[PDB]
Design an enzyme around this catalytic site. Structure first.
Site, PDB file in Angstrom:
ATOM      1  N   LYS A   1       6.679   3.325 -13.677  1.00 51.45           N
ATOM      2  CA  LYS A   1       7.374   1.571 -14.532  1.00 51.45           C
ATOM      3  C   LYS A   1       7.162   1.269 -16.409  1.00 51.45           C
ATOM      4  O   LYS A   1       7.249   0.760 -17.360  1.00 51.45           O
ATOM      5  CB  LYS A   1       6.988   0.477 -14.154  1.00 51.45           C
ATOM      6  CG  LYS A   1       7.306  -0.876 -13.973  1.00 51.45           C
ATOM      7  CD  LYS A   1       7.052  -1.685 -13.090  1.00 51.45           C
ATOM      8  CE  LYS A   1       7.280  -3.425 -13.337  1.00 51.45           C
ATOM      9  NZ  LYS A   1       6.734  -3.946 -11.768  1.00 51.45           N
TER      10      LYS A   1
ATOM     11  N   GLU B   1      -1.469  10.328 -14.300  1.00 51.21           N
ATOM     12  CA  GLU B   1      -0.949  11.658 -14.089  1.00 51.21           C
ATOM     13  C   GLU B   1       0.298  11.746 -14.392  1.00 51.21           C
ATOM     14  O   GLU B   1       0.753  13.242 -14.713  1.00 51.21           O
ATOM     15  CB  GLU B   1      -0.646  11.454 -12.807  1.00 51.21           C
ATOM     16  CG  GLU B   1      -2.188  11.464 -11.281  1.00 51.21           C
ATOM     17  CD  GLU B   1      -2.857   9.422 -11.444  1.00 51.21           C
ATOM     18  OE1 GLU B   1      -3.377   9.798 -10.502  1.00 51.21           O
ATOM     19  OE2 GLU B   1      -2.853   8.916 -12.689  1.00 51.21           O
TER      20      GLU B   1
ATOM     21  N   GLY C   1       6.258  -1.610  -8.300  1.00 53.49           N
ATOM     22  CA  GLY C   1       6.635  -0.545  -8.121  1.00 53.49           C
ATOM     23  C   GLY C   1       6.887   0.250  -6.664  1.00 53.49           C
ATOM     24  O   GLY C   1       7.713   0.633  -6.294  1.00 53.49           O
ATOM     25  N   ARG C   2       5.721  -0.445  -5.185  1.00 51.44           N
ATOM     26  CA  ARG C   2       6.163  -0.190  -4.125  1.00 51.44           C
ATOM     27  C   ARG C   2       7.401  -0.678  -3.048  1.00 51.44           C
ATOM     28  O   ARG C   2       7.553  -0.891  -2.037  1.00 51.44           O
ATOM     29  CB  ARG C   2       4.738  -0.552  -3.425  1.00 51.44           C
ATOM     30  CG  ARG C   2       4.485  -2.205  -3.873  1.00 51.44           C
ATOM     31  CD  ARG C   2       2.856  -2.033  -3.136  1.00 51.44           C
ATOM     32  NE  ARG C   2       2.864  -3.097  -2.670  1.00 51.44           N
ATOM     33  CZ  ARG C   2       2.098  -4.297  -4.383  1.00 51.44           C
ATOM     34  NH1 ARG C   2       1.699  -3.043  -4.958  1.00 51.44           N
ATOM     35  NH2 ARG C   2       1.596  -4.949  -4.506  1.00 51.44           N
TER      36      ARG C   2
ATOM     37  N   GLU D   1      -0.974  -1.519   0.117  1.00 57.12           N
ATOM     38  CA  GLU D   1      -1.701  -2.347  -1.356  1.00 57.12           C
ATOM     39  C   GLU D   1      -0.378  -3.526  -1.988  1.00 57.12           C
ATOM     40  O   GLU D   1      -1.422  -4.091  -2.417  1.00 57.12           O
ATOM     41  CB  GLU D   1      -0.190  -1.096  -2.984  1.00 57.12           C
ATOM     42  CG  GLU D   1      -1.337  -1.209  -3.715  1.00 57.12           C
ATOM     43  CD  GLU D   1      -0.627  -0.195  -4.782  1.00 57.12           C
ATOM     44  OE1 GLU D   1      -1.307   1.013  -5.402  1.00 57.12           O
ATOM     45  OE2 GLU D   1       0.983  -0.348  -4.821  1.00 57.12           O
TER      46      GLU D   1
ATOM     47  N   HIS E   1       1.074  15.355  20.644  1.00 54.42           N
ATOM     48  CA  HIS E   1       0.091  16.430  20.882  1.00 54.42           C
ATOM     49  C   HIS E   1      -1.102  16.700  19.941  1.00 54.42           C
ATOM     50  O   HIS E   1      -2.297  17.401  19.860  1.00 54.42           O
ATOM     51  CB  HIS E   1       0.463  17.546  20.851  1.00 54.42           C
ATOM     52  CG  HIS E   1       1.669  17.949  21.725  1.00 54.42           C
ATOM     53  ND1 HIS E   1       2.073  18.150  22.868  1.00 54.42           N
ATOM     54  CD2 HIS E   1       3.228  17.712  21.346  1.00 54.42           C
ATOM     55  CE1 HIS E   1       3.186  17.486  23.532  1.00 54.42           C
ATOM     56  NE2 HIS E   1       4.227  16.903  22.526  1.00 54.42           N
TER      57      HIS E   1
ATOM     58  N   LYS F   1      -9.613   3.818 -12.566  1.00 53.11           N
ATOM     59  CA  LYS F   1      -8.916   4.307 -13.682  1.00 53.11           C
ATOM     60  C   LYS F   1     -10.107   4.584 -14.772  1.00 53.11           C
ATOM     61  O   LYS F   1      -9.638   4.896 -15.513  1.00 53.11           O
ATOM     62  CB  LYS F   1      -7.597   3.251 -14.076  1.00 53.11           C
ATOM     63  CG  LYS F   1      -6.255   3.839 -13.221  1.00 53.11           C
ATOM     64  CD  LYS F   1      -5.432   2.719 -13.707  1.00 53.11           C
ATOM     65  CE  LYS F   1      -3.743   3.396 -12.419  1.00 53.11           C
ATOM     66  NZ  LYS F   1      -2.787   1.622 -12.338  1.00 53.11           N
TER      67      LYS F   1
HETATM   68  O1  LIG Z   1       5.688   3.829 -12.396  1.00 61.74           O
HETATM   69  P1  LIG Z   1       3.856   4.142 -12.576  1.00 61.74           P
HETATM   70  O2  LIG Z   1       3.726   2.913 -13.930  1.00 61.74           O
HETATM   71  O3  LIG Z   1       4.311   5.048 -13.092  1.00 61.74           O
HETATM   72  O4  LIG Z   1       3.165   3.363 -12.100  1.00 61.74           O
HETATM   73  C1  LIG Z   1       2.520   3.657 -10.721  1.00 61.74           C
HETATM   74  C2  LIG Z   1       1.572   3.525  -9.464  1.00 61.74           C
HETATM   75  O5  LIG Z   1       0.837   3.843 -10.275  1.00 61.74           O
HETATM   76  C3  LIG Z   1      -0.787   2.484  -9.393  1.00 61.74           C
HETATM   77  O6  LIG Z   1      -1.677   3.291  -9.429  1.00 61.74           O
HETATM   78  C4  LIG Z   1      -0.141   1.254  -8.891  1.00 61.74           C
HETATM   79  O7  LIG Z   1      -0.874   1.836  -7.529  1.00 61.74           O
HETATM   80  C5  LIG Z   1       1.604   1.738  -8.499  1.00 61.74           C
HETATM   81  O8  LIG Z   1       2.150   0.047  -8.394  1.00 61.74           O
HETATM   82  C6  LIG Z   1       2.547   2.091  -8.485  1.00 61.74           C
HETATM   83  O9  LIG Z   1       3.192   2.537  -7.576  1.00 61.74           O
END
Ligand SMILES: O=P(O)(O)OC[C@H]1O[C@H](O)[C@H](O)[C@@H](O)[C@@H]1O
Lengths: 556, 556
Positions: free
Chosen positions: A210, A216, A271-272, A357, A388, A518
């Protein structure tokens, strides 16, 4: 906090205090032959049925009435209408919340800042459709002139969990489609093991982010681009092998991808809640755009069910209310999602982000610190695997654990003339029956007597063989797990989460709680370089860094 | 119940009631510069170091002392010795508990019913070694004379989770080995999608089950045999493609398996403690017998640490004690396992069985019902992924969640001159620091000021940006995730579970709670077959069956 000050809530809590100890599921069923009929919803979508059976819950008519009154008193209907109409209900970020626009098949206008969003939503969908056709047909060629065989999604959290869960759940709809891979962890194992199995000539990378600044994802994307260019040796070839899914054109350009190679979404897509947008490209590539549209259509059906149904018969509302009953009256920390479907093996992991979240929050719209519980810990594994592993604790531990059991009536693989699915269904039904009913000491005693046990061995074993029961479940059963039905199920839980957030007076749509980690990671990164001791933190952080530096070069 | 009547426990509880509200991690570190030194264990195994840093916990000198005293007065030392000596401590089944014998590399006799078990343990291990040589070398041929390329483990629970988690974790050590597949769910998707990727000519099936009558496993095994015989067309060819991990000689023979290819284990090997036995065959086939031996040796090292070390510096004892403090004094329902390692992605799922099926109990040794909490709900996902899914709730929700953070110092994949791993480590360190320290109003305020927020916007956003902190963690850091170190880690958690069970006065080694669901499933299975209405259950079970019978015909 608005919830605990609410008079309808105080009534519910007082009733729970006075009466809840008297609720016994075995007895509720014996006294009322109509209990299933009166505590279930059978939804006909015209593309399959979804039965939401909430009868094995610790509730009666009075409790459901009190819960519905609470939803009314907390303003759930007005809040819902405000979401659907494009009001800026994400109040901390001052944004609309419009995942419902992404799947708005009806195309009724939804305005943000006086402007309809549907033309741009539909433009991106058209671009997705055209791209999927080019790739899946074999027309789109790589830098050496070969058709694409592998799609690699690079992204994390909201840019990973949805596409992964959906491609896993809809695997039978992927015949003739390219292979899909998901790279998410910064841990170099993830990208290394993926790239090891791939050829740069036939691999298409999808960089999903986004912000397009997530550490990462950008690091992974840079590693992928380096691996690619080592083979291709031509910067212009990147345009044949990398596509971006983002809101941030500037950062996409900076990375080295042109906006023509970008599919956009918008700030009002959380995002979620993003798999319905451009972020769903890897779904559409794997199963085809037609099946992706059916996924959207199923969510749309559930959106309309949520919008138009009176609260007392509204599926996501009832699910939300049952959760509030267990969270705020019984104090249960957790909620288990137990799909009896191997294809749904990542469904619970998806709703860990979607639920936790969203509603793992402690400040209200008024600025007040909550003085009550908010979102639960979500967990689970598919049945029958879970039986199990951990059902021992569910049956005979010391925790109350609301569980949702889910299953399709029709299997995608009716092998052995249906024998496997028959057994699967039997276990699905028996577990919630067992959780409800239990086994009384007198019943366990007769079983031991009939097993030919001596009075001595009998008395020692007896208490261990007793099941207290009275453990509540939902059973959610649907005709078949098709793209449409899956879309409807995901949206149902999205709306459950929404309703709970409104009742708690929190913002389900922000995530300020990820910022601190972060920040602190960016500070530690440079300190790991070199062999000098770090003294700038607490003694644990310092000591852990010392260990890392000391153990770095031990040749095992 | 024994625990609640124990004076050391009542003292701990009273101390908690009077003092716990004043325990602040920030203040504990500020007051004591030696905190990391005094609240951590640096274990040198001679095959790498394991650092157990428990300093970021809500404990001080007095608390640890009170905890160790409770362990002593609950009989932990005597119970441990009884396990190691072959005493029948599984008291409801009258059985020994001897996973420690399986990896007893010292070969010091361990007697059950006056007979040393080591000769038999070593005989099976020798047979495993021979089997591994035959398959891995290519000397074991399929029915058309070809070498085996694929191994398929068929089993459930303890016959599945261990081998899966370990082969995933030790994937780098599998060079030159056959591919390994795990089939566990009765859901026919699981076997069907596995068999679709396989050749009958080059696939070897391992049927893992004590009785060789387990319904899911035997049904899956029979389906695999049917698929095999469609190609092979010769009953005698089964013996080249099917082996058993079992004691039921007749059933194995009737299946068509050469009784030479049955590898045995014993009743004192619990399923959820079984990967160290014959059950580990798929591990040894995948990574080689030498690496399997290293796994056993790592566990053996931790067994000796547990046996010989005074409680106050005994790693599994301390982990157990911190758990008791959070469970029985703070009331935390859950325990999160968060490995910063993609290869460890099934570690948490494994300990769901190991922990929850062991300690999800409610009857004590005396037959009395507990009046206190027992085993927690275990959950987690690998870092850094979890940060982008559920850490929002860990940082800013309303739940206290003890977390274990785990990481190797050295990566198996040091790509980009170690850049990925540097970032992974920085996140690992930063998250526990963040959970401990939080972010004060004064710190958040300066951030909002720098962002240029208006007086009104600053005031409104401020509480949403504050992190309360004081969230406790363990950090477990180790040189490298080798077979040996993995073995040590698994054994450490096995012994943590054992210690908690003793302190709760429960049986960690039975599983009477799975029986009721099994009985009820057997009754429902035949009822699903025909067209007639089922009315023999409660109205929910009946109604769910009615829906299944109606919807199974529907054409979509
Ligand atoms: O899609 P991005 O900008 O790479 O962000 C990806 C993610 O990073 C964050 O840590 C938040 O937990 C989320 O809301 C999200 O899904």
């Amino acid at each position: 906090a608005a919830l605990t000050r609410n008079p309808q809530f105080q009534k519910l809590l007082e009733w729970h205090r006075a009466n809840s100890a008297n609720l016994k599921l075995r007895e509720l069923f014996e006294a009322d032959p109509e209990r299933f009929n009166n505590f279930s919803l059978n939804l006909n979508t015209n593309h399959g049925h979804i039965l939401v059976d909430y009868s094995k819950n610790l509730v009666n008519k009075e409790v459901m009435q009190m819960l519905v009154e609470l939803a009314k008193s907390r303003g759930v209907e007005a809040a819902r209408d405000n979401m659907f109409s494009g009001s800026k209900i994400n109040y901390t970020e001052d944004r609309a919340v419009l995942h419902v626009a992404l799947r708005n098949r009806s195309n009724t206008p939804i305005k943000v800042d006086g402007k309809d969003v549907m033309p741009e939503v539909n433009r991106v969908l058209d671009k997705m459709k055209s791209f999927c056709q080019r790739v899946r047909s074999g027309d789109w060629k790589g830098y050496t002139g070969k058709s694409i065989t592998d799609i690699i999604n690079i992204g994390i959290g909201g840019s990973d969990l949805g596409p992964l869960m959906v491609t896993e759940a809809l695997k039978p709809y992927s015949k003739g489609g390219p292979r899909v891979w998901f790279v998410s962890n910064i841990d170099g194992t993830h990208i290394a093991k993926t790239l090891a199995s791939l050829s740069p000539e036939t691999s298409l990378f999808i960089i999903a982010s986004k912000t397009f600044t997530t550490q990462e994802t950008i690091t992974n994307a840079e590693t992928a681009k380096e691996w690619f260019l080592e083979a291709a040796k031509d910067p212009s070839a990147v345009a044949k092998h990398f596509v971006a899914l983002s809101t941030n054109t500037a950062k996409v350009k900076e990375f080295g991808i042109d906006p023509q190679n970008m599919l956009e979404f918008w700030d009002w897509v959380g995002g979620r809640y993003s798999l319905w947008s451009a972020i769903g490209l890897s779904i559409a590539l794997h199963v085809g755009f037609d099946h992706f549209e059916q996924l959207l259509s199923g969510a749309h059906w559930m959106d309309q069910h949520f919008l138009k149904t009176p609260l007392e018969k509204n599926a996501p509302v009832l699910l939300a209310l049952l959760g509030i009953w267990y969270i705020n009256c019984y104090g249960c920390e957790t909620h288990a999602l137990l799909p009896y479907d191997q294809y749904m093996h990542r469904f619970a992991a998806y709703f860990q982000q979607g639920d936790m979240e969203s509603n793992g929050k402690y400040i209200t719209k008024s600025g007040a610190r909550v003085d009550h519980q908010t979102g639960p810990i979500v967990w689970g594994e598919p049945g029958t695997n879970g039986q199990h592993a951990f059902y021992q604790l569910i049956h005979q531990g010391t925790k109350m654990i609301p569980c949702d059991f889910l299953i399709p009536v029709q299997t995608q693989h009716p092998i052995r003339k249906g024998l496997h699915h028959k057994i699967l269904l039997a276990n699905f039904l028996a577990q919630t029956e067992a959780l409800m009913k239990g086994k009384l000491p007198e019943e366990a005693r007769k079983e031991l007597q009939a097993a030919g046990k001596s009075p001595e061995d009998l008395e020692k074993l007896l208490p261990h063989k007793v099941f207290e029961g009275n453990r509540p479940t939902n059973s959610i059963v649907f005709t078949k797990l098709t793209p449409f039905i899956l879309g409807a199920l995901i949206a149902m839980y999205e709306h459950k989460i929404f309703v709970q957030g409104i009742m708690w007076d929190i913002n389900s749509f922000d995530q300020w709680g990820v910022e601190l980690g972060k920040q602190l990671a960016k500070k530690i990164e440079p300190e790991l370089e070199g062999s000098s001791a770090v003294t700038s933190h607490d003694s644990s952080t310092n000591g852990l860094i010392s260990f890392i530096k000391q153990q770095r070069d031990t040749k095992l």
